[PDB]
């Protein structure tokens, strides 16, 4: 019919699904989390400075080993590192070096890329014959490429500038489900533990929940001020953090369907670049534009340390699934492995 | 201490080494990105340069090996990806001198070159604002005033008074005047006076980050 | 991926040749070489290795300054040159390509060989426990080694390596470290072993699995071979 209905109708919705959120908060977490001891102050020092690169580390991604890790830079090349010695594993030649995410599959036989060019570049580690080259090129996005995330070695998800973000097919180079209610750049994603769902930050301010399966936003969450330069799923998947150039991290819990906790202050005016939980949940670990990553007890919201060991922006931040590192990727083009 | 790790530390530094190499080739070839609205006015450079996202052009002119970056094809925001170019040596910028007669363009023009000669990554960045259709300006000029786009415009309606007036009404938006330079140029229809004048651009680039570097400048 | 090897044939005793190979369809600059051979009758044994910048040159005692092993990536060829070469120099020698990173596999592909016919301690010892077992399809067998050093590393991979070689075909990797398995390798192969005993199972025993299986380390060079061990059907 016309706006002046539907829009009406879309905005009675928000007001309702606002009146149920605040029907639902019954309390915030600082007060039911008072009854949670301090983590106290978490030092930490670089075990590894990985120097390999030449220019800017955009992302770096922890493999399900806990020991390699794939990291991205402008100077186009993948890095596979082994955290423990330093060793350069692989160094890959990318076609297109404007690259700004990179993951590696959970089984380690594939290594994804993509950037300003709109493929995810998917490369087979394991060949035969003994170089790295490209499985696929996953071309039809048309915005540049913020994310991709393997699901398994034959499902990634990705997300794109423009308002897309997109689960693909390895075997066949097509789109399997397409996901659209993203109405801005779609710069991050995370896949929850199961694989079941994953959480797709824009900078719309929106967060989106997808279901992998049935394409469907489940639950969308609007707190942050601004663009959700970072997301990642807290290890139970139940909840997730979202980073904000609003210098802000925001906690979303998909049963709540509301904000339980936002992590600020008034020193920190830098945006987030990257987010990720250690394996308990219990420390969130922020990058900024600050050359800082800031250690976030992620129940009771303070500062539970820093990791200063950087000059430039930090881009990137994976923590290992063992819970046994923190990597933090810079523009420093140093690469630091903390715990 | 090591037995078959060594072997790997061997292939570790042998990428080292490989890596380095590839960054000497990196670092000696120029990086020069393309900005400007409309697909026409950047591909008329494109096709002047003698030798889908980003489409990045190689080119070699008296042994300087250029990489051109047309970001046109990207339709993204630019707060998010612009970053990547905090490094080049110049942003070629193009605008076409007609897009003043017509759906306004001209100010959408001045308007990112405001950004882009503002935005905080390019602060010590050097711009080349390539005024593109010279000809088809020259011809407009003699049926359309100036003034339809500018109001505040007194002046004769001649064309190397409108061109001279267009180009400060550009270069006085850069408010970086001392760390910018913005090395204007009318696009030649003779050719190799384009690709000249971005080597000559690119060389007194060059030379400025130099004297940086050796802290005279 | 093939390794083609030529250079063979009858040399006088005390001469020289060069024994080549050919890489096709691989990185081959990407990769280490090794030479092994095999006496007419005993087991393997190695010979040289050249890394993949071509540095880091080890021979065998044996063959030590007596053979030069050399390689030329931009003709992706290989080239042992052998001089004053002896009666116990005569072998079958193979062409064996080596990678070394976290996860893989060397050894992985061994060359078809070629035949040379001369006309007539500080190492660990593989004491590969017996000469030969009889199997039936379907069966289970236990095969062991000792190694005269414990292969558990302070960084707690176990440098053991399991080979099968077919009867008149060149060797092929079945097990890596102790406990991973090649490509192409049955998942019903299965190694095991406390670092400095060790067991390789072979479970569900087919057809294809008869033939001299060979133990191997590779905690220090030489990286001497045991006897193997002969599976008769």
């Known amino acids: 019919s016309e706006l002046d209905q539907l829009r009406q109708e879309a905005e009675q919705l928000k007001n309702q699904i606002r009146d149920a959120r605040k029907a639902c908060a019954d309390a915030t977490l600082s007060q039911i989390t008072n009854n949670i001891d301090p983590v106290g102050r978490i030092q930490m020092r670089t075990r590894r400075t990985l120097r390999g690169h030449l220019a800017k580390i955009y992302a770096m991604h922890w493999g399900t080993d806990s020991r390699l890790l794939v990291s991205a830079s402008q100077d186009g090349k993948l890095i596979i590192w082994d955290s423990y010695t330093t060793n350069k594993v692989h160094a890959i030649p990318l076609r297109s070096s404007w690259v700004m995410t990179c993951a590696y599959a959970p089984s380690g036989n594939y290594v994804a890329c993509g950037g300003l060019d709109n493929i995810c570049s998917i490369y087979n580690l394991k060949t035969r014959e003994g170089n790295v080259r490209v499985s696929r090129e996953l071309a039809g996005h048309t915005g540049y490429l913020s994310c991709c995330r393997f699901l398994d070695d034959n499902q990634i998800v990705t997300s794109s500038g423009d308002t897309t973000c997109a689960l693909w097919d390895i075997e066949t180079g097509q789109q399997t489900t397409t996901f659209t209610g993203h109405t801005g750049d779609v710069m991050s994603l995370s896949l929850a533990p199961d694989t079941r769902l994953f959480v797709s930050g824009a900078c719309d301010a929106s967060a989106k929940l997808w279901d992998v399966r049935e394409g469907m936003c489940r639950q969308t969450f609007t707190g942050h001020e601004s663009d959700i330069n970072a997301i990642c799923f807290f290890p139970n998947g139940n909840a997730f953090a979202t980073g904000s150039d609003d210098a802000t991290c925001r906690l979303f819990d998909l049963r709540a369907d509301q904000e339980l906790m936002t992590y600020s202050h008034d020193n920190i005016i830098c945006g987030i670049t990257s987010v990720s939980f250690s394996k308990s949940g219990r420390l969130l670990l922020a990058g900024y534009d600050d050359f800082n990553c800031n250690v976030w007890d992620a129940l009771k919201a303070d500062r539970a340390g820093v990791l200063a060991g950087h000059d430039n922006r930090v881009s990137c931040l994976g923590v290992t699934d063992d819970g046994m590192a923190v990597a933090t990727g810079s523009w420093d083009s140093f690469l630091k492995i903390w715990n | 201490l090591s037995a078959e790790d060594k072997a790997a530390v061997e292939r570790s530094k042998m990428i080292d080494r490989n890596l380095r190499e590839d960054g000497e080739k990196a670092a000696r070839e120029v990086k020069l990105l393309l900005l400007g609205a409309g697909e026409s006015g950047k591909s008329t450079i494109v096709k002047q340069m003698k030798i889908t996202g980003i489409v990045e052009t190689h080119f070699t002119f008296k042994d300087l090996h250029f990489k051109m970056f047309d970001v046109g094809a990207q339709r993204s925001e630019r707060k998010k990806w612009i970053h990547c170019f905090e490094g080049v040596t110049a942003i070629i910028f193009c605008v076409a001198l007609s897009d003043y007669d017509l759906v306004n363009r001209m100010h959408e023009s001045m308007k990112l070159f405001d950004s882009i000669c503002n935005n905080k990554w390019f602060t010590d960045t050097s711009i080349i604002l390539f005024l593109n259709k010279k000809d088809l300006f020259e011809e407009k000029i003699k049926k359309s005033p100036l003034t339809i786009c500018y109001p505040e415009y007194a002046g004769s309606n001649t064309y190397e008074e409108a061109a001279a007036y267009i180009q400060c009404q550009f270069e006085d938006l850069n408010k970086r005047k001392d760390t910018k330079e913005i090395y204007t140029h009318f696009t030649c229809s003779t050719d190799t006076k384009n690709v000249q004048f971005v080597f000559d651009a690119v060389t007194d680039v060059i030379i400025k980050n130099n004297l940086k570097d050796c802290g005279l400048f | 991926v093939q390794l083609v090897e030529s250079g063979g044939g009858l040399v006088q005793p005390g001469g020289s040749r060069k024994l080549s190979c050919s890489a096709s369809g691989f990185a081959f600059s990407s990769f280490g070489m090794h030479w092994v051979r095999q006496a007419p009758e005993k087991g393997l044994e190695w010979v040289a290795y050249?890394?993949?910048?071509?540095?880091?040159?080890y021979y065998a005692d044996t063959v030590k300054g007596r053979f030069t092993i050399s390689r030329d990536d931009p003709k992706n060829t290989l080239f042992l040159q052998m001089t004053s070469l002896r009666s116990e120099d005569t072998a079958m020698y193979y062409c064996?390509?080596?990678?070394?990173?976290?996860?893989?596999?060397?050894?992985?592909?061994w060359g078809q060989g070629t035949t040379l016919t001369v006309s007539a301690s500080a190492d660990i010892v593989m004491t590969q426990a017996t000469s030969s077992v009889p199997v039936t399809p379907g069966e289970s067998v236990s095969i062991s080694c000792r190694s005269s050093k414990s292969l558990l590393h302070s960084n707690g991979n176990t440098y053991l390596y399991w080979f099968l070689q077919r009867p008149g075909q060149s060797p092929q990797l079945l097990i890596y470290?102790?406990?991973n398995l090649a490509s192409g390798v049955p998942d019903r192969f299965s190694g095991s072993g406390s670092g400095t005993a060790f067991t390789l199972t072979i479970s569900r025993l087919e057809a294809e699995d008869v033939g001299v299986y060979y133990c191997?380390?590779?905690?220090?060079?030489?990286?001497?071979f045991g006897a193997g061990t002969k599976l008769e059907l």
């Open positions: 470290r102790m406990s």
């Open positions: 050249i890394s993949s910048g071509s540095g880091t040159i």
């Open positions: 064996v390509r080596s990678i070394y990173y976290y996860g893989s596999s060397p050894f992985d592909f």
């Open positions: 191997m380390q590779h905690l220090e060079y030489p990286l001497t």
